[PDB]
Write an enzyme that holds these catalytic residues in place. Structure first.
Site, PDB file in Angstrom:
ATOM      1  N   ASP A  20       0.998  -1.071   0.061  1.00  0.00           N
ATOM      2  CA  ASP A  20      -0.168   0.056   0.254  1.00  0.00           C
ATOM      3  C   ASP A  20       0.963   1.469   0.504  1.00  0.00           C
ATOM      4  O   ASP A  20       1.388   1.654   1.071  1.00  0.00           O
ATOM      5  CB  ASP A  20      -0.769   0.170   1.031  1.00  0.00           C
ATOM      6  CG  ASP A  20      -1.560   1.158   1.344  1.00  0.00           C
ATOM      7  OD1 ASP A  20      -2.144   2.320   0.439  1.00  0.00           O
ATOM      8  OD2 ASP A  20      -2.645   0.952   2.245  1.00  0.00           O
ATOM      9  N   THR A  21       0.788   2.111  -0.767  1.00  0.00           N
ATOM     10  CA  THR A  21       2.434   2.692  -1.384  1.00  0.00           C
ATOM     11  C   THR A  21       1.256   4.351  -0.344  1.00  0.00           C
ATOM     12  O   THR A  21       2.521   5.628  -0.486  1.00  0.00           O
ATOM     13  CB  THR A  21       2.478   3.406  -2.709  1.00  0.00           C
ATOM     14  OG1 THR A  21       1.713   3.496  -3.652  1.00  0.00           O
ATOM     15  CG2 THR A  21       3.174   2.396  -3.312  1.00  0.00           C
ATOM     16  N   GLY A  22       0.422   4.866  -0.446  1.00  0.00           N
ATOM     17  CA  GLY A  22      -0.400   5.719  -0.307  1.00  0.00           C
ATOM     18  C   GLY A  22      -0.696   5.161   1.570  1.00  0.00           C
ATOM     19  O   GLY A  22      -1.409   6.323   1.679  1.00  0.00           O
TER      20      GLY A  22
HETATM   21  C1  LIG Z   1      -9.043  -0.628   2.193  1.00  0.00           C
HETATM   22  C2  LIG Z   1      -7.192  -0.678   1.664  1.00  0.00           C
HETATM   23  C3  LIG Z   1      -6.738   1.005   1.950  1.00  0.00           C
HETATM   24  C4  LIG Z   1      -7.166   0.999   4.025  1.00  0.00           C
HETATM   25  C5  LIG Z   1      -6.258   0.617   4.131  1.00  0.00           C
HETATM   26  C6  LIG Z   1      -7.867   1.729   0.903  1.00  0.00           C
HETATM   27  N1  LIG Z   1      -6.845   3.217   1.635  1.00  0.00           N
HETATM   28  C7  LIG Z   1      -5.989   3.757   0.344  1.00  0.00           C
HETATM   29  C8  LIG Z   1      -4.438   3.621   1.880  1.00  0.00           C
HETATM   30  O1  LIG Z   1      -3.527   3.612   0.840  1.00  0.00           O
HETATM   31  C9  LIG Z   1      -5.172   4.935   1.778  1.00  0.00           C
HETATM   32  C10 LIG Z   1      -5.043   6.489   1.814  1.00  0.00           C
HETATM   33  C11 LIG Z   1      -4.942   7.942   2.780  1.00  0.00           C
HETATM   34  C12 LIG Z   1      -3.625   8.539   3.110  1.00  0.00           C
HETATM   35  C13 LIG Z   1      -3.564   9.482   3.805  1.00  0.00           C
HETATM   36  C14 LIG Z   1      -4.951   9.542   4.076  1.00  0.00           C
HETATM   37  C15 LIG Z   1      -6.198   8.749   3.467  1.00  0.00           C
HETATM   38  C16 LIG Z   1      -5.956   8.181   2.882  1.00  0.00           C
HETATM   39  N2  LIG Z   1      -4.193   4.969   3.424  1.00  0.00           N
HETATM   40  C17 LIG Z   1      -3.786   4.609   4.489  1.00  0.00           C
HETATM   41  O2  LIG Z   1      -4.989   4.522   5.404  1.00  0.00           O
HETATM   42  O3  LIG Z   1      -2.806   4.675   5.320  1.00  0.00           O
HETATM   43  C18 LIG Z   1      -3.466   4.571   7.124  1.00  0.00           C
HETATM   44  C19 LIG Z   1      -1.454   3.764   7.455  1.00  0.00           C
HETATM   45  O4  LIG Z   1      -0.380   4.708   7.013  1.00  0.00           O
HETATM   46  C20 LIG Z   1      -0.863   6.015   7.049  1.00  0.00           C
HETATM   47  O5  LIG Z   1      -0.509   6.805   6.883  1.00  0.00           O
HETATM   48  C21 LIG Z   1      -1.156   7.585   5.184  1.00  0.00           C
HETATM   49  C22 LIG Z   1      -2.760   7.250   6.133  1.00  0.00           C
HETATM   50  C23 LIG Z   1      -2.946   6.286   7.071  1.00  0.00           C
HETATM   51  S1  LIG Z   1      -8.268   4.744   1.675  1.00  0.00           S
HETATM   52  O6  LIG Z   1      -7.810   5.572   1.084  1.00  0.00           O
HETATM   53  O7  LIG Z   1      -8.884   4.208   2.441  1.00  0.00           O
HETATM   54  C24 LIG Z   1      -9.540   4.179   0.384  1.00  0.00           C
HETATM   55  C25 LIG Z   1      -9.063   4.727  -1.003  1.00  0.00           C
HETATM   56  C26 LIG Z   1      -9.996   5.039  -2.041  1.00  0.00           C
HETATM   57  C27 LIG Z   1     -11.245   3.042  -2.202  1.00  0.00           C
HETATM   58  C28 LIG Z   1     -11.798   3.108  -2.924  1.00  0.00           C
HETATM   59  O8  LIG Z   1     -11.732   2.072  -3.908  1.00  0.00           O
HETATM   60  C29 LIG Z   1     -11.528   3.227  -0.803  1.00  0.00           C
HETATM   61  C30 LIG Z   1     -10.361   3.698   0.165  1.00  0.00           C
END
Ligand SMILES: CCC(CC)CN(C[C@@H](O)[C@H](Cc1ccccc1)NC(=O)O[C@H]1CO[C@H]2OCC[C@H]21)S(=O)(=O)c1ccc(CO)cc1
Lengths: 99, 99
Positions: free
Chosen positions: B25-27
């Site tokens: 998960d690069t995000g």
């Molecule tokens: C289901 C798998 C993921 C959640 C676990 C999905 N996410 C993408 C994810 O990369 C988000 C992207 C993200 C990034 C920043 C803020 C909100 C969302 N990152 C995230 O939640 O990371 C958390 C862990 O590390 C921290 O550092 C960033 C936030 C914390 S998501 O943003 O919730 C999401 C994106 C798109 C959809 C539609 O398909 C559904 C959900």
């Protein structure tokens, strides 16, 4: 190019007359952009991640330029804290993970 | 390996002798796993995602083998929708984005 992950993989994207910074996010099935008033038909959806769900508007066949690469596809718009380029568009610009 | 993005980049990880499936998960800044037991000291922490904030247990210096590549780092355990490998460990295994 190659983007290391020492920092957030933020890149410049364009959607119409708006340039925005967005994450190249392998963890997202679909692209989600911060609230913006796009033209055209849409449909409501709820998407979930850490913390729970947010409500978004699904727009189809929206052209987005990502670091000068052309893409066109589904874009979810709603109260996300960060702009997120998801897999639906990452494939279109030729993005892979490598290690 | 090179991993394309037409499907979720799910991989098998080994942690505490257990095999689990996790999403590259690069995000994500951080690595977050669903409820599990891990030994040793942990610290209560909070983190935010797309839907708000959650409480997690922070474990430091945990070994995880990710698709056969070794990492040792911080693992947060809590109510994530799916096990995610974030940048803190993606950097350790030499993961980059390329397009
Ligand atoms: C289901 C798998 C993921 C959640 C676990 C999905 N996410 C993408 C994810 O990369 C988000 C992207 C993200 C990034 C920043 C803020 C909100 C969302 N990152 C995230 O939640 O990371 C958390 C862990 O590390 C921290 O550092 C960033 C936030 C914390 S998501 O943003 O919730 C999401 C994106 C798109 C959809 C539609 O398909 C559904 C959900």
């Amino acid at each position: 190019p190659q983007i290391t992950l020492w920092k957030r993989p933020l890149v410049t994207i364009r959607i119409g007359g708006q340039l925005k910074e967005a994450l190249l996010d392998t963890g997202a099935d679909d692209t989600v952009l911060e609230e913006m008033n796009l033209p055209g038909k849409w449909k409501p959806k709820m998407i979930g991640g850490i913390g729970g769900f947010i409500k978004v508007r699904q727009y189809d066949q929206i052209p987005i330029e990502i670091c000068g690469h052309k893409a066109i596809g589904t874009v979810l718009v709603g109260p996300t804290p960060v702009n997120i380029i998801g897999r639906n568009l990452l494939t279109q610009i030729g993005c892979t993970l490598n290690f």
